Amino acid sequence: VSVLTMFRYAGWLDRLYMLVGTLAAIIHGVALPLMMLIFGDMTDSFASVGNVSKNSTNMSEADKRAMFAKLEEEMTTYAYYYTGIGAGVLIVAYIQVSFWCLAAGRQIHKIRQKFFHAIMNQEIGWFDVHDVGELNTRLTDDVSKINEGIGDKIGMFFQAMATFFGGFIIGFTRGWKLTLVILAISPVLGLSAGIWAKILSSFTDKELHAYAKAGAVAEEVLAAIRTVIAFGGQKKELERYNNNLEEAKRLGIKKAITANISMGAAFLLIYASYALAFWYGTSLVISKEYSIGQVLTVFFSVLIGAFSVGQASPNIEAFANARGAAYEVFKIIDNKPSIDSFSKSGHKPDNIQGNLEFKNIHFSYPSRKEVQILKGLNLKVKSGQTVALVGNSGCGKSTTVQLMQRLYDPLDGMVSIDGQDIRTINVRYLREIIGVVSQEPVLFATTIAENIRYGREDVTMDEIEKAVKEANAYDFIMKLPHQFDTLVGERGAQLSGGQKQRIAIARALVRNPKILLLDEATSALDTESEAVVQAALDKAREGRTTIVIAHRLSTVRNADVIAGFDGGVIVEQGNHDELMREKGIYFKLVMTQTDVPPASFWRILKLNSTEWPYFVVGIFCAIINGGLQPAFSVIFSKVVGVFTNGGPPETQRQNSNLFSLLFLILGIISFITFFLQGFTFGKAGEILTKRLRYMVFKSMLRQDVSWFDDPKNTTGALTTRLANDAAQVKGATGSRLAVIFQNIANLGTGIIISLIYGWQLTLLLLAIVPIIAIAGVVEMKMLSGQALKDKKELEGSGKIATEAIENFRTVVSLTREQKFETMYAQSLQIPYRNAMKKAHVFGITFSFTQAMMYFSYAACFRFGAYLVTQQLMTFENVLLVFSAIVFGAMAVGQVSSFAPDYAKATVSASHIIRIIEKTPEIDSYSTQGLKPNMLEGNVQFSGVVFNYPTRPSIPVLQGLSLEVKKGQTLALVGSSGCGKSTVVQLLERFYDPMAGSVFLDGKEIKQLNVQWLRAQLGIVSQEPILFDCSIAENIAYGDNSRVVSYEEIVRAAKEANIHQFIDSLPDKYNTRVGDKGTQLSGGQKQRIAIARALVRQPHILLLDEATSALDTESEKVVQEALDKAREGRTCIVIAHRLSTIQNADLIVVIQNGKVKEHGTHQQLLAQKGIYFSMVSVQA
Ligand SMILES: CC(C)(C)c1cc(C(C)(C)C)c(NC(=O)c2c[nH]c3ccccc3c2=O)cc1O
């Protein structure tokens, strides 16, 4: 059978009306050629009347009476014919929509009904085969996609074929010669599109690869930002970013030639094939057979059929997606095992049920998503035993609990029963005989008594009132309004843990159960209600058949037999007194267990007025490219005019002359004007996309502060804004020239053409164009005004579906199943009533959308008839009104297509505005006099408080003052690593101190030029920023006030010990490492990071964190570089593993932002405070 035979399944009239709607769609397709036919039929008659009026004419007014009487007699019969086709399309439109909404709805209601019930009759396999929430959500929307998968798309497919083949049958019958040419050009247009797609593709690939390099050049440089600021490499990296965008600017400009030429060639094939068909068509009259006038309008109906099949393709593509998501997951609705638990079957266990014995279990994990981790379990319980399990071990004991039901059934080992087996028996009785107590009861609610009744659906209030007492739930059912029928939200969203627990114990007791079973049930309770719950779980046991598991060895002694499970298998089996007399494994266990929505405006115009290269000739080009399109209709009007009303004189020469004019004027100009319009806005966008990207990336690379402290930013996410905004703003250029073009193809030429209308054709144009624009703008609202309300009826009906399965301990009561289906039988009924209603609404609006075609033709006939005919009827300008209506329909589509490409581009403008206005924290200041006498300085700190760029991370530095002298070490340690690290990272200016300040001596580092500061500061990175440059550059990523030379790369290699690598390899300083450093271990990377500080002679030096992940060589040969990098130069080092850096002339202990001890290392080893207490725990 077909896949669609399973979608359109069951029912009677539910299937039969699909045939009625299919027949309506066929007739609605055949009506479109018949509307073309009559305008042709009039053209045969008018080509006779009009030419006889120039050829053996009855004077020049008796023809205007005798011939015109027959024309208005005929037009009075035509007034029946086109009105009958009009009445037809109004009816079949509503019958087609009645199929789409009401016949589909007659299946889709029962499909949704049996879908919610199919989760319930999936019984066990719903737990294994994907997961709750999403499996319910995708299925809930995919059974909505089935509506299109059986609906309108199938109608549109048959309707377009009926227009196509119906038009072709008439076009063969009246003149197959031209109808064969319409077949022959279709593969040529398809081949042209088959070139256009390759031209669009294999230029964009290279534009993407050119940009991908500019992306990677931004990403690593922004991640490394404060280090690239400290080296000075911005003078290299800003041009690496620029030139990869110059390559993209060499590529996009060539696509802006080739794609525009390939579209112009497709337009040229259209103008040329139409012109050749017209000239061949009149040659098949004034020489030859199989033409007249009407045949041309018949051949145009075949082209309307090809357009109708084009309009069907997006509906067939939507139908392919409606096959898509729905038909595969339809197997989880049915073709699943579907019976697995025996949900409404089985004979009763009238051996009372109780006498279980598990044997040689090796079973699966629950849901089979994890492997069978359990190996070895055997376990007894018999009628008149509390068996208590000891040796608790999580999932490896919880499997034994979930195996107590038709939810998991053993395969790896067995259960044994003293009678008929528990896998075979009555599943409702099996749910209700046991009180199955989990610490968390995941349960749907509405009242407390209804939640208790979700244990067993047959109850009396006399059972309920005892159940709330003996579960000890009575305290809150006395405090709450309406008591046991007190109102509560879904999942119990107004109840604490111990309250839900005592309600779930009442939900057990109301069964009159014989057995108690406990999923570790003392765990996760509140310590008030844990005791009140234990007293309820003791009250729930009349000296009777129980299987208890708990973290408290109280309920384990409130019992009859211990069963011990150190790992797996039963190791001990005796009384709690016995295993404490004889002091076994139970006694061993007793000894341990007792985006920017404010879219911008105005400023955008002055910004683009600063960005753009003023190619204003593209505006003139868009105007003339628009005005050329109605000139096709002017020359075609002149062909119809001379052919209907010239008489025979010169006709073959007039047709040949107008053919030559038509072919040349459209083929030459339209190609050039589309090409030059596309190539002008393309080149404007090539400047804009490059110029914006350079300015915003340069702005980012001059503001880390107030943008990397943003928890709402991510480096790659900013690189997506660099991707998207610079492309969206490019689309926001060419679309505006397309809006200029369509205005001139429409009213900007159409009103000038109306200066030669006899007012009747102006009334015709004005009666149609705004009304068809209003119709589509209403049709929009009619559709969307259902869909939002349909979604909210479905959403409310979805909450009560997910609440039926996430609340999985409702499958452990199983009698609420058909009560949920009873809720769904009313809930699915409100959107189905909405669907029955909208079948009329869409019926009348889609019917009115046909009525405008009858009205258009009927007005065009009845505004020429009699009143213009008496003058001689206008053999011109009638065609121009229809072309202006087509340019009006084109205009509405062109303008509404670019509406989101206003809105998105105004959001991209808000993103661009934030980043061009910058953060003023890392710029070229000059209030502090830059003095050379203090490159090493005497760095003063005073009153200092600091909180990290992660802004919630507390003011961790708190009132500090310190100094470090010219050439001195200042080693820092402190109670949580923040007391040391913040002092380096504020001197980096990677954030400002919120109070206090820091000074080079008597002049402020908050006010010193950040690039002068970053000329004297060296900084050691935990990770070297790395593209595959030479080793020389992979030390020296630029310099802020120096010149890199042989001597500095010698010092930086030798002092940092990294010359171990550089003097060894091929090429020495020239050689390679790959992006991120393919052969660079931690020890090499930190020795490179030391070299990067040293290669500019750093008069002040900063060692951020004195080990990364280092040990052995990789640590001690790094310390052998740390000691060589400090001393004689003003060096701050934040001590980590104190068995790296303890060598310093001064150390300071910064406890929670204040000094607690200080001195040289040996003076602090004497101080028996914090420092010696931090040494005396490292070793
Ligand atoms: C916005 C909305 C409601 C989806 C809508 C819009 C239009 C436009 C804007 C193109 C008139 C249309 N129009 C069309 O699809 C068509 C417009 N002009 C034609 C001219 C000749 C042959 C077919 C069409 C056509 O299908 C239909 C709509 O349903």
Residue numbers in the entry: 33 to 626, 687 to 1271
Quote the passages of the study that discuss this structure, keeping the authors' original sentences.
The drug is then translocated across the plasma membrane by transition of the protein to the outward-facing state, which is more favored when ATP is bound. In P-gp the central aqueous cavity has been found to house the binding sites for transported drugs and inhibitors.
We associate the presence of ivacaftor with the appearance of an additional density in one of the conformational states detected. The additional density is in the central aqueous cavity and is associated with a wider separation of the two halves of the transporter in the inward-facing state. Only map a contained a single feature that satisfied all these criteria (blue mesh, arrow). In accordance with the last criterion, a single ivacaftor molecule could be fitted into this density, and the overall rocket shape favored a fit with the 2,4 tert-butyl groups of the ivacaftor molecule corresponding to the two ‘fins’ of the rocket-shaped density (CC = 0.960 vs. CC = 0.938 for the 180° rotated version). The density is surrounded by residues contributed by TM helices 6, 10, and 12, and hence is positioned more in one lobe of the aqueous cavity. Residues F339 and Q343 within TM6 in the refined atomic model are close enough to form π-π (F339) and H-bonding (Q343) interactions with the quinoline group of the modeled ivacaftor molecule, and the phenolic hydroxyl group of the drug could also form H-bonding interactions with E871 within TM10 in this model. Taken together, the data for ivacaftor is equivocal: the single density observed would imply that ivacaftor shares P-gp substrate characteristics, whilst its overall location in one lobe and over towards the cytoplasmic leaflet of the bilayer is suggestive of binding characteristics of an inhibitor according to the work of Nosol et al..
